[PDB]
Amino acid sequence: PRGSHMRVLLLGPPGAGKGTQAVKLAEKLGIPQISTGELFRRNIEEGTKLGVEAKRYLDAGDLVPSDLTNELVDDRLNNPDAANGFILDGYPRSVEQAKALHEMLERRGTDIDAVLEFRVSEEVLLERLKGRGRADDTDDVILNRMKVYRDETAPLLEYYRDQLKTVDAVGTMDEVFARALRALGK
C-alpha cells in the first residue's frame, strides 16, 4: 500500500457517472475534484467575460475552444488545494488538451497517475441524461455531445493506453465506486 496522493483522470461519454464518482473518490482519497463543466457554469452564472464566450459552446454541446479551456485549468491547478493530487472530471477531452495538461503538470514537477474510462452503453447514457434534466440534456444537444465525444475525446483512450483502466460503469453508484477503487488499486 502506497498512499492516496494521486492524480486521476476520469474519461467517458456524457452521462457515464464521472461527476458522481469524482465526488465520491475525492472524499475517499482526500483530494479535490475539478470539473471543467462546473467551472464554466460558475463563470456563466457570475457573468464573467469567459462565461459570456463559453456559453454559446456549452448550450450547443460543443467543446469550448482549447485556448480558453487550457488557461482555465492551468489557473485552477494553481490553487494550493490541488498540490497533493486531484481528480479531473471532463478535462482533457481532446489530444491537444492532454498535451497541454502534460505541460502544465511537468512545470509543477508532477504528472497523471491513473486514467479511468467509464464504459457505459448508449441506451443507459440516454436514460441517465433524460433523468438528469440539466439544460444541455435535450435530444439534439445530447446527439452533438455524443459526436463530440466520439470525434475528440475517444482518441484519448489510445493516447493514455499505458495508464488506462476501463471500469464497467453500469451498476449501482456503490458498485461503480468499488470498481473504480479496484482499478486504482484501492
Ligand SMILES: Nc1ncnc2c1ncn2[C@@H]1O[C@H](COP(=O)(O)OP(=O)(O)O)[C@@H](O)[C@H]1O
Ligand atoms: N451508477 C449509477 N446508476 C444510476 N444513475 C447514475 C449512476 N451514476 C450517476 N448516475 C446519474 O446519472 C446522471 C449522470 O451522472 P453524472 O455523474 O452527472 O455523469 P457525467 O458527469 O459522466 O456526465 C446523474 O443524474 C446521476 O445522478
Ligand SMILES: Nc1ncnc2c1ncn2[C@@H]1O[C@H](COP(=O)(O)OP(=O)(O)O)[C@@H](O)[C@H]1O
Ligand atoms: N475539457 C473541456 N473542453 C471544452 N469544453 C468543455 C470541457 N469540459 C466541459 N466543457 C464544456 O462544458 C460542457 C459541460 O461539461 P460536463 O459538465 O463535463 O458535462 P457532463 O457532466 O454531462 O459530462 C461541455 O459540453 C462543454 O461544452
Ligand SMILES: [Mg+2]
Ligand atoms: Mg458531470
